[PDB]
């Protein structure tokens, strides 16, 4: 798939992901949710080759859920992101690599801090205040570089996110059918139903 954005504010992480799914020259769906809850306070969005994305995401989801049950404990976002990176770094030298790029947004309940990790299909991990994959960053990073503060509220983070989507909608040749926005904070994961 195409556009996935992420921004880490004061007390939360916000992920925005496009709704479009295309097959041939036809848009099959305009309400697709390109994300999986890995744990109550960790959300992973994804984008890449068709089929590989969901298979990888669900495979990661199963592994983290298995860990959660085994230890009766939620892994830190950092630990999850490292596990994900290793699986991708393992994948890239396989016979047929998984062509998936991900953003991992999580709230660390121990440190009481939001955390955003950007990982590409090669296994290239970076912690960031805001991130994107593919061409999305080319349009949006200039706005984020300008407007972003670390003490921003969740509401201010959504407003800056709206501005990023508006810029994408103006300058991209691609119709991605808007975005589904989800917030990750101390209270868990919730979806912004009006955006």
């Amino acid at each position: 798939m195409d556009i996935i954005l992420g921004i880490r504010v004061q007390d939360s992480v916000i992920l925005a992901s496009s709704k479009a799914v295309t097959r041939g020259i036809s848009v099959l769906k305009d309400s697709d949710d390109k994300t999986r809850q890995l744990s109550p306070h960790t959300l992973m969005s994804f984008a890449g080759e068709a089929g590989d994305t969901v298979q990888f995401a669900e495979y990661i989801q199963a592994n983290i859920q298995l860990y959660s049950i085994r230890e009766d404990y939620e892994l830190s976002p950092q630990a999850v992101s490292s596990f994900v990176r290793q699986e991708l770094a393992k994948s890239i030298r396989s016979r047929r690599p998984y062509q998936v790029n991900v953003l991992i947004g999580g709230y660390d309940k121990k440190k009481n801090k939001p955390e955003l990790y950007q990982i590409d299909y090669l296994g290239t991990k970076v912690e960031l205040p805001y991130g994107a994959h593919g061409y999305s960053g080319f349009y949006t990073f200039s706005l984020l570089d300008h407007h972003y503060r670390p003490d921003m509220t969740t509401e201010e983070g959504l407003d800056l996110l709206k501005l990023c989507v508006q810029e994408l909608e103006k300058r991209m040749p691609m119709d991605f059918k808007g975005v589904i926005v989800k917030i990750v904070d101390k209270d868990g994961i919730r979806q912004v139903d009006d955006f």
């Binding site: 230890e71 892994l75 830190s76 950092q78 630990a79 490292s82």
Partner: protein
């Protein structure tokens, strides 16, 4: 064929016990006593070397206390060679976890893994079990200071204070009597040595017949330090507590 000579190491007795596990535990009961005591501000590991010689090079010797990583250590009771096979596996497992999750392995997870390896030898393969009992002393940020034990059956349990090897029945009674929940490391050090001094089969407890170690938050600020005691340092703590 070969069936004739097979001892069948992985079978139940009519009473529902595992022969080889029970006999391995009998082996371990003759090994030098090892004691672990958990305190609020640290953990103590004390162990007794078996009938040594004057010509044994003690300062370079290690038969009881081993380091698994910076946060976790083990006291051994049983066959040393068997223990080293498992110890090296545990060291690798801790590094695999650290490579995967970029965090130090939680104590229980390491303990469960080793205990599962022991379990496997009792259920399949037709091989004899490992004649080893461990006391795991470790720290992590979830449960803090922790003491565990595992035995050849592959069963493991958590403890405030525990002994393995010889005279555990006597040792456990002494620990159960003098142990309190608000206890500190310096007090736990004294309790461990006093218990060994009373349970030992030797005439007197000396520095050359002991291995000793502590895991303390007594490290500069929020962090943990492992201290494997040297022969001279064991000699000093024996004088301090008033045993020699």
């Amino acid at each position: 064929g070969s069936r004739r000579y097979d001892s069948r190491t992985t079978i139940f007795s009519p009473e529902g016990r595992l022969y080889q596990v029970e006999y391995a535990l009998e082996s371990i009961s003759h090994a030098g006593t090892a004691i672990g005591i958990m305190a609020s501000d640290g953990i103590v590991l004390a162990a007794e070397r078996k009938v040594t010689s004057t010509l044994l090079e003690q300062d370079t010797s290690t038969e009881k206390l081993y380091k698994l990583n910076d946060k976790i250590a083990v006291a051994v009771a049983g066959l040393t060679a068997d223990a080293e096979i498992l110890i090296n596996t545990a060291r690798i497992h801790a590094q695999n976890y650290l490579k995967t999750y970029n965090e130090d392995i939680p104590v229980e997870i390491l303990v469960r893994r080793l205990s599962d390896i022991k379990q496997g030898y009792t259920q399949h393969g037709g091989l004899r079990p490992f004649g080893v009992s461990f006391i795991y002393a470790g720290y992590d940020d979830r449960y803090g200071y922790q003491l565990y034990t595992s035995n050849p059956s592959g069963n493991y349990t958590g403890w405030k204070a525990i002994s393995v090897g010889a005279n555990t029945s006597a040792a456990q009674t002494l620990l159960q009597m003098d142990y309190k929940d608000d206890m500190k490391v310096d007090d736990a050090i004294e309790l461990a040595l006093k218990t060994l001094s009373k349970t030992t089969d030797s005439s007197a407890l000396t520095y050359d017949r002991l291995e000793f170690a502590t895991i303390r938050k007594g490290a500069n600020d929020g962090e943990v330090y492992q201290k494997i005691f040297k022969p001279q340092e064991i000699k000093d703590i024996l004088v301090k507590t008033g045993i020699t």
